[PDB]
């Protein structure tokens, strides 16, 4: 957690790890300071083929800072105006009435506030 | 090599920031020794490259100004 792989304190995502002893390395142990989160430095120690090695995969999600691309399987419907409906825009859910707008967004902007 | 990306009388100004393994770049332009005025900069891209940046250098083929955030 100090010299190899640090996660931030505000991490949002999943960590998965499984045992692989049927198919079975190096880790840094001397450094002048820790690492910042998601930093990679590329003093080395070799693992002994002690416990059976595990494989670890970490999944990190960006929360709608850009137009959305990675969504689950859901079916889209037509949009209804001037009527009180439940709406769901890119996982953003709510209840209200939708109206055509005169606001002038810029191409990096996705929603108002 | 770990990351690669290829894409298709005036002042060009940029802001470079690095946090959480991400490198953010902002860019603005204005047509006019640094003039006094107000100008606002729009984001272009952030790169998910996880290295420490403590130095940098411009690449030339006549003046450029550097300030710190």
């Amino acid at each position: 957690a100090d010299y190899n792989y640090k996660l931030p304190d505000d991490f949002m995502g999943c960590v998965l790890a499984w045992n692989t002893r049927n198919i079975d390395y190096k880790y840094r142990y001397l450094r002048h300071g820790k690492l910042r989160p998601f930093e990679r430095d590329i003093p080395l120690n070799d693992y002994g083929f002690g416990y059976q090695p595990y494989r670890v995969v970490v999944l990190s999600f960006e929360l709608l800072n850009a137009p959305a691309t990675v969504c689950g399987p859901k079916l889209s419907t037509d949009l209804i105006k001037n009527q009180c409906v439940n709406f769901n825009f890119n996982g953003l859910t709510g209840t209200g009435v939708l109206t055509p707008s005169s606001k002038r967004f810029q191409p990096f902007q996705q929603f108002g506030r | 090599c770990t990351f690669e990306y290829i894409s298709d009388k005036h002042l060009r100004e940029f802001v470079f920031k690095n946090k959480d393994g991400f490198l953010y770049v902002y860019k603005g332009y204005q047509p006019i020794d640094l003039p006094s005025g107000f100008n606002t900069l729009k984001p272009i891209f952030k790169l998910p490259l996880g290295i420490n940046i403590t130095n940098f250098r411009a690449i030339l083929t006549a003046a450029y100004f550097v300030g710190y955030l």
Partner: peptide, 30 residues
Amino acid sequence: TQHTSSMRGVYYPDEIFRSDTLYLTQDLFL
């Protein structure tokens, strides 16, 4: 030589539309 940055280096803080307000933000600015 050294010069001054007279009200330079302002960028849009996030990807959110805002209109006719005053917004306070805390970030890395010049």
